[PDB]
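User: Modeling request: complex.
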Amino acid sequence: RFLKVKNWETDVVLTDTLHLKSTLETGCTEHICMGSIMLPSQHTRKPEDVATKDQLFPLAKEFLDQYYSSIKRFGSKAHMDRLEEVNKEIESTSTYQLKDTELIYGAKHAWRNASRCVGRIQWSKLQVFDARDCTTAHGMFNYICNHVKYATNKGNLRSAITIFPQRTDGKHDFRVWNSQLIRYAGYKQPDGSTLGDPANVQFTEICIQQGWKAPRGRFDVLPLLLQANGNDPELFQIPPELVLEVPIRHPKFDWFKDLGLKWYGLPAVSNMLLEIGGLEFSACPFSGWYMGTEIGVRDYCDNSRYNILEEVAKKMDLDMRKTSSLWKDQALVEINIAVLYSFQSDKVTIVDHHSATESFIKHMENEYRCRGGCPADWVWIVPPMSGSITPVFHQEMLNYRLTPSFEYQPDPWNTHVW
Amino acid sequence: RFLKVKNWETDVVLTDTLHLKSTLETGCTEHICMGSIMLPSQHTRKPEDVATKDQLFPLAKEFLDQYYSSIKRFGSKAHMDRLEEVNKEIESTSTYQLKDTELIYGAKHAWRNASRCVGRIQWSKLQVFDARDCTTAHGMFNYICNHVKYATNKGNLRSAITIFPQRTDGKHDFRVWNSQLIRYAGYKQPDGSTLGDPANVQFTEICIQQGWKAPRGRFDVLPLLLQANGNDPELFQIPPELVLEVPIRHPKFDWFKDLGLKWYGLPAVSNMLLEIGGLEFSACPFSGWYMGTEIGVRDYCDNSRYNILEEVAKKMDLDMRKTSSLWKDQALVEINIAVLYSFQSDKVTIVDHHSATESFIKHMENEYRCRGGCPADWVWIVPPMSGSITPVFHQEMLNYRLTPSFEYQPDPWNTHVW
Ligand code: HEM
Ligand code: HEM
Ligand SMILES: Cc1cc(N)nc2cc(-c3ccc(OCC4CC4)c(CN)c3)c(F)cc12
Ligand SMILES: Cc1cc(N)nc2cc(-c3ccc(OCC4CC4)c(CN)c3)c(F)cc12
Ligand SMILES: C[C@H](O)[C@H](O)[C@H]1CNc2nc(N)[nH]c(=O)c2N1
Ligand SMILES: C[C@H](O)[C@H](O)[C@H]1CNc2nc(N)[nH]c(=O)c2N1
Ligand SMILES: [Zn+2]
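Assistant: Request completed. Predicted assembly structure:
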């Protein structure tokens, strides 16, 4: 009940007392481990499965207690008067409203608790933008544009989150239908192959269905589809000057520019749900900067993504008949030296998987000492290439789900009543 | 209760009904996932925690039923007369003895159930050597030498297991003290650095402590330390002609021979415990062939193993000041093309991590169709380099512990009464 996690590269041993405070569930049982299921039911939020006035006050009290404990005023009168104040509003309104300071704490700790995120050494350096006064899709488009500008910061990227009004009933819901604020379109072809990004082919067509004007090329930035207060979503195009992009070159191979690759600088995921004190925020886009491999390994090289190992190995002229020539591996390392180099030579913030995973080990030390633990998902923390030459491969990690938290939710076009 | 596992590269969906038959536990709970703890208490067997005459007959019946079900004679008279026969012996002797055919089935299914093993497409092609008539360490050394010869098969390797007498009391225990039959010595130095293999430095010194004559070099094959029926273990040196080794060269870089590397062909793990029908076999060395990465990635490049990324990147002349030049990754791929090439050009059976992981996906299809599932540990199945350009990265796997099974046990020098 005071568990032990070893590192097998250092023999360092840490002790996790934080998992005791865990409330949510994991999907594993004593007789089956689901640690490799991608989207377990526990990590998802249906708009039906909200909460009711009863369910709310434990979640509120629980949250308020950890907040006042953290500003060094647990159980005090200022604390207890807030419990009463929320209590009264939860009886009255059946819901309740967070202070600015409570929204900022709750947001930063949903990132801090994000067990699948390797960048968390930065969790308290998060800029929270309060968009809870937003009422229209145009309002949403305005707040999201300012988010992009700020977080992008001319390439010196800054973490940020923009938080639209919380769910209440379930129908009147704020939702960004894009999975990420900046994303490349995906168009299928006559012969069936895919230009652009296969991941977003479904979404690309929903935008065309709502009347988008697709420049049917490769790296076409999708428009935003913003649903405000349950009303049908509306298309807006980010001003291109606001979309920072990196052309991908190589510090040795001159033909790498010929490949004609580029990516956007800002990873800003827009489809997930923030949960603070039992309140659900269905529109909460959040952003930081990339780890190289997310582009260079997954985006570019997943078979069902850009799938470029083909042409890169070609231009390297590689033994491609035999599978055991490791021609796939060989071209994957070059593609990742190129994304790093390109981003750095353009002064756009990026981290390599070695730097980031050492920071996570550092951050894990801090959380275990100053917090009693650090929830971590090994399956997601280990980078998708050169796994075992990074320190996180040899680090045993306890996974458990604390709150405040980020969660998945269905795509709104499967649930929305039009 | 009839769970679903998706593949996210193919959208293939499989259904696991086999996990229902699961008996052992996993270490995870509804509130915490231990899927990345290396040696969980559930995967270990203490020599105290055997079983007693009561505990035995369920385990026997359970095992016997799955055996007779599998030779297409469930619940029959031949089956029921065996249940009675074992029952009687479990009352009489408080233990019992397996048929040859029951030992062979049980062994093959302990491999079949090995959730952390990616080579299992081969599980029914396993040669079982019955060493249950062995009484002395010299007998053990004889059986192990024949195992090496057979399994090595002049380079065309064959899977095999040799099974020494089962535990009974707990003191009179057959144990191979080596962690693997063939392993390279590990000697510390004056300045502290390690020649040989750092992993086995502890074990190397126990052999010297028992009087081994160390040729204090690099790739010195350790002697066997064989404990028979609880008596103190005894040193034997495998005839060198029986130890097949591969010198490691590169199909491009001529300086790769200068590195002066080699590995043994036969991976044969000797320290684990086979568990069949509630009987414990503490000495059961088992072997197949290597996947490249176990040598080329872990053995050669782990910081606390051979740790050669240093010199390889040097001879490639690599940007080594900056961490983000990926010089570590770049040299890891070359080292793995070299292990593959060397093993193949010597006609020694080896598999690359791409070939092996596709086979595992094939094997997983077969087990789900003809067995209702396949227990799998993603943390261990995904290879330690180029993780996400192999199909197992995108395959959700259910982990659960069936029986017959292989298990860890303490090192005998911490438990043995001398
Ligand atoms: C500041 C630099 C950051 C870096 C380098 C980083 C890194 C990563 C990486 C590599 C992943 C894996 C993504 C994938 O595999 O597709 C991830 C996931 C994630 N990140 Fe971070 N991140 C950063 C900032 C943030 C911020 C600011 C937030 C929230 C406000 C956040 C929350 C998350 C969440 C919720 C996940 C997925 C967890 C899940 O599926 O449950 N990250 N991150
Ligand atoms: C025939 C070719 C085989 C291949 C390519 C193979 C491959 C592998 C690999 C790559 C690992 C990971 C080892 C590590 O990461 O250090 C592993 C583990 C393992 N293998 Fe296999 N293996 C083979 C045969 C066998 C046989 C014949 C047995 C048993 C009779 C076996 C049982 C196991 C077990 C028990 C583990 C560890 C599971 C645990 O820790 O619970 N394998 N195997
Ligand atoms: C702030 C941030 C920075 C970064 N550097 N990376 C990030 C990656 C994700 C992320 C989480 C889950 C994802 O996918 C879930 C599969 C679709 C269901 C994806 C996209 N693959 C991204 C994320 F949220 C935030 C990230
Ligand atoms: C038959 C076979 C073939 C192969 N190709 N590979 C194999 C690897 C292991 C294995 C399992 C666990 C291990 O280590 C556990 C850590 C020490 C506690 C190691 C050595 N690292 C090897 C094994 F059993 C059998 C293997
Ligand atoms: C099946 C498996 O759960 C799936 O491929 C996961 C594995 N680990 C991952 N890890 C990260 N960081 N991102 C991912 O998309 C995935 N995908
Ligand atoms: C901490 C973590 O459990 C440990 O590094 C594991 C990870 N996965 C592994 N996978 C394999 N195949 N072999 C290993 O030794 C390990 N080590
Ligand atoms: Zn689990």
